[PDB]
Design a protein around this ligand. Structure first.
Ligand code: HEM
Ligand SMILES: CCCCCCCCCCCCCCCC(=O)NCC(=O)O
Length: 456
């Protein structure tokens, strides 16, 4: 028998919309899920969606024969600048499968081995920056992780140096990207987006989109005036084996913007949360540091050595369990269907997967879901299907998962090998939201173990 779906408090004609009028919407939705359960309806004028938090219902949502990727309102706003790039295209648009086929080779094992040296280049810059700090100084963690991740996707993917470690202020592309993501997030609660009160928001949004595109212009120009075989090489020259066609210029521009953003923001968040959890759990930090010291025996890490940092990998997966940095994904019903044998859906109905909640399902993980325990991932293959989804689902899953994890494992391994870390301010977790999640104001002090770093 069908069941009435729980729903949060309403605001008259605005329904639930005002619940999104907060600078921390995902965290607000997590609290609503804690109060209402595995599923709740969320209505706004002219639209409805249903938020899923349990593995038993999410496993159904992840059945590709019944549901396909949907562009949530957030992705529709991001599409204003990411167009039909891979992250914001519908599965049925020609450019999705075409770009997917052309770019998948850029994330093969062979490609990853080829990216390794450039990843080390930026990682060494991070380690040198910290080695060079004076006794009285400290590290702004998310800031430096963003310097590291943006520079890494820039160099490995486009042979372009953002030179973020040569700047004391965030890189211009970052300032505009963050403002654009913040606008998309703030636009979620706007009942009347065309009210003149938002003209300055619109003007600033166009300005930020222009800055990102001006950068894309530079990357394209520098490649033209430059022999590489990287992500950009495939975007410019690769042919889809199905159609035999290469991407057109417009889509290429969207892919560059897409990869510069998806290719670093969430990885900066991951590294930031991983270091946060490590300093808050001394015993776990000790285990991870022991592995880094034992495994990374050379001046700089080799590809094989990074693959051997098992515990560091577990630490990263546990950080993704608690705070998956792209916290949700959306789906739509391909045909009428019944969810969990109790909730009838009509073709087209939308669902939102609240990843942080899925990852706190006590019926899967046990009651200690709030504890940071990397050991949960000792044998990742044994976790029930669809219980852990920080990288999305099926054919629309993250194309750069291995890239992100290789980069994060390498850098965290080097960090743990070279410094002892101190949470000198007893930092209180404050998670800033820009659709994606990242600690804000997280600072630490790093005391060098004075171990020489090898040449790049
Ligand atoms: C730990 C860091 C990362 C996390 C948590 C993450 C998470 C995700 C998630 C959840 C999706 C699916 C979104 C949806 O269904 O709406 C996704 C898609 C995607 N990600 Fe990642 N990602 C990460 C790093 C990266 C990196 C480093 C790259 C580029 C090298 C990347 C490129 C993409 C692209 C292009 C897609 C769209 C794939 C497609 O639909 O064809 N991601 N990612
Ligand atoms: C071009 C690359 C774009 C990368 C963007 C990555 C961001 C990931 C999205 C995280 C999910 C945001 C969720 C915001 C809260 C919410 O419930 N929104 C509902 C909605 O947008 O319809």
């Amino acid at each position: 028998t069908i069941k009435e779906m729980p729903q949060p408090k309403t605001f008259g004609e605005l329904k639930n919309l005002p619940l999104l009028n907060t600078d921390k919407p995902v965290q607000a939705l997590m609290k609503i899920a804690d109060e209402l359960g595995e599923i709740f309806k969320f209505e706004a004028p002219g639209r409805v969606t249903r938020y899923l938090s349990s593995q038993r219902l999410i496993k159904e949502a992840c059945d590709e024969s019944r549901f396909d990727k949907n562009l949530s309102q957030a992705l529709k706003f991001v599409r204003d600048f990411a167009g039909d790039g891979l992250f914001t295209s519908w599965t049925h648009e020609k450019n999705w499968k075409k770009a997917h086929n052309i770019l998948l080779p850029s994330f093969s094992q062979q490609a990853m081995k080829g990216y390794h040296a450039m990843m080390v280049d930026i990682a060494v810059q991070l380690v040198q920056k910290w080695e060079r700090l004076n006794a009285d100084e400290h590290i702004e963690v998310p800031e430096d992780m963003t310097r590291l991740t943006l520079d890494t996707i820039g160099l490995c993917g486009f042979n372009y140096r953002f030179n973020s470690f040569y700047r004391d202020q965030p890189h211009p592309f970052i300032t505009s990207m963050v403002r654009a993501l913040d606008e998309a997030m703030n636009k979620l609660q706007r009942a009347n987006p065309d009210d003149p009160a938002y003209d300055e928001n619109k003007r600033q949004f166009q300005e930020d989109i222009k800055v990102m595109n001006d950068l894309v212009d530079k990357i394209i120009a520098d490649r033209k005036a430059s022999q590489s075989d990287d992500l950009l090489t495939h975007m410019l020259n690769g042919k889809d084996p199905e159609t035999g066609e290469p991407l057109d210029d417009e889509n290429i521009r969207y892919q560059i913007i897409t990869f510069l953003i998806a290719g670093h923001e969430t990885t900066s968040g991951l590294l930031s949360f991983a270091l946060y959890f490590l300093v808050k759990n001394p015993h776990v930090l000790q285990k991870a540091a022991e592995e880094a010291a034992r495994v990374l025996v050379d001046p700089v890490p080799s590809y094989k050595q990074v693959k051997q940092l098992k515990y560091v990998g577990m630490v990263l997966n546990e950080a993704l369990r608690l705070w998956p940095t792209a916290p949700a994904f959306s789906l739509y019903a391909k045909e009428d269907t019944v969810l969990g044998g109790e909730y009838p859906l009509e073709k087209g109905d939308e669902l939102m997967v609240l990843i942080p909640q899925l990852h706190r399902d006590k019926t899967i993980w046990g009651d200690d879901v709030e504890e940071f325990r990397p050991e949960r991932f000792e044998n990742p293959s044994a976790i029930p299907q669809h219980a852990f989804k920080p990288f999305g689902n099926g054919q629309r899953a993250c194309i750069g998962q291995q890239f992100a994890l290789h980069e994060a494992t390498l850098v965290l391994g080097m960090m743990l090998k070279h410094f002892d870390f101190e949470d000198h301010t007893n930092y209180e977790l404050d998670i800033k939201e820009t659709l994606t999640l990242k600690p804000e104001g997280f600072v630490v002090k790093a005391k060098s173990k004075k171990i020489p770093l090898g040449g790049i």
